[PDB]
UniProtKB/Swiss-Prot annotation, chain A:
Keywords: Acetylation, ATP synthesis, CF(0), Hydrogen ion transport, Ion transport, Membrane, Mitochondrion, Mitochondrion inner membrane, Transport. Its main location: mitochondrion. The lineage of its organism: Eukaryota, Fungi, Dikarya, Ascomycota, Saccharomycotina. The gene is ATP7. It comes from Saccharomyces cerevisiae (strain ATCC 204508 / S288c). Belongs to the ATPase d subunit family. One of its GO terms (cellular component) is mitochondrial inner membrane. The keyword Ion transport applies. GO terms for molecular function: proton transmembrane transporter activity. This is ATP synthase subunit d, mitochondrial. It comes from the Eukaryota. The keyword Hydrolase does not apply.
Curated annotation (Swiss-Prot), chain B:
F-type ATPases have 2 components, CF(1) - the catalytic core - and CF(0) - the membrane proton channel. In yeast, the dimeric form of ATP synthase consists of 17 polypeptides: alpha, beta, gamma, delta, epsilon, 4 (B), 5 (OSCP), 6 (A), 8, 9 (C), d, E (Tim11), f, g, h, i/j and k. It is found in: Mitochondrion; Mitochondrion inner membrane. This is ATP synthase subunit 4, mitochondrial. Disulfide bonds: none annotated. Present with 12900 molecules/cell in log phase SD medium. Belongs to the eukaryotic ATPase B chain family. The modification Phosphoserine is found at S4. The chain holds residues 141 to 192 of 244 of the full protein. Transmembrane segments: none annotated. It comes from Saccharomyces cerevisiae (strain ATCC 204508 / S288c) (Baker's yeast).
């Protein structure tokens, strides 16, 4: 019976708020209807009704038919719309975590020679650095955008 | 990673609950219909006996 985990079981999207509210209201109403109603058939006092009625053999005949069987508003488990969707939902939402979440401390596992990392090593691991520097020279921008704010320029004046 | 891992349990629980919720509605409606039909027949017989 997850109370606080069923309100936050959805993602960042607020689109499932309407679906979660409808499911909770339907479950509470169904449980309340079964507890407010009596869990038994009917009393059917034939002992005091057959001898009080005016017409002969009328209570006795009605009593016998009401205690047999009659139709009721019920269904069968043929239209399994929620059962068929359960397998598909697990196969797209719950099974996606087995390959996305599982793939996601390798940063600390590779150790850190930043005091002795070579710029040739950065050029080898990133040709993007070489291309950015080359185009930045070709257009002529000797400025470096956003360098001066965290790193002091140490011009004399 | 914590959010993605939590989603797997939540989606698996939410999938199973949907099938149970549909069964629970059908079972409550059947019991309510049978109780209402039995109470109607009892009330009709009692009212007729009490008038007679």
């Amino acid at each position: 019976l997850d109370w606080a985990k069923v309100i936050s079981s959805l993602r960042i999207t607020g689109s499932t708020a309407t679906q979660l509210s409808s499911f909770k209201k339907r479950n509470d109403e169904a449980r309340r209807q079964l507890l407010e109603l009596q869990s038994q058939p009917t009393e059917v006092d034939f002992s005091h009704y057959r001898s009080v009625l005016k017409n002969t053999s009328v209570i006795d005949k009605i009593e016998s038919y009401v205690k047999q069987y009659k139709p009721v508003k019920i269904d069968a488990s043929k239209q399994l719309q929620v059962i068929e969707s359960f397998e598909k939902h697990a196969m797209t939402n719950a099974k996606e975590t087995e390959s996305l979440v599982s793939k996601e401390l390798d940063n600390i596992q590779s150790a850190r020679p930043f005091d002795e990392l070579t710029v040739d090593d950065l050029t080898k691991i990133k040709p993007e650095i070489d291309a950015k520097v080359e185009e930045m020279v070709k257009k002529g921008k000797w400025d470096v955008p956003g360098y001066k704010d965290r790193f002091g320029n140490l011009n004399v004046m | 990673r914590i959010d993605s891992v939590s989603q797997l349990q939540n989606v698996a629980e939410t999938t199973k609950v949907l099938f149970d919720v549909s069964k629970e509605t059908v079972e409550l409606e059947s019991e309510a219909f049978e109780l209402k039909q039995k109470v109607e027949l009892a009330h009709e017989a009692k009212a007729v006996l009490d008038s007679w």
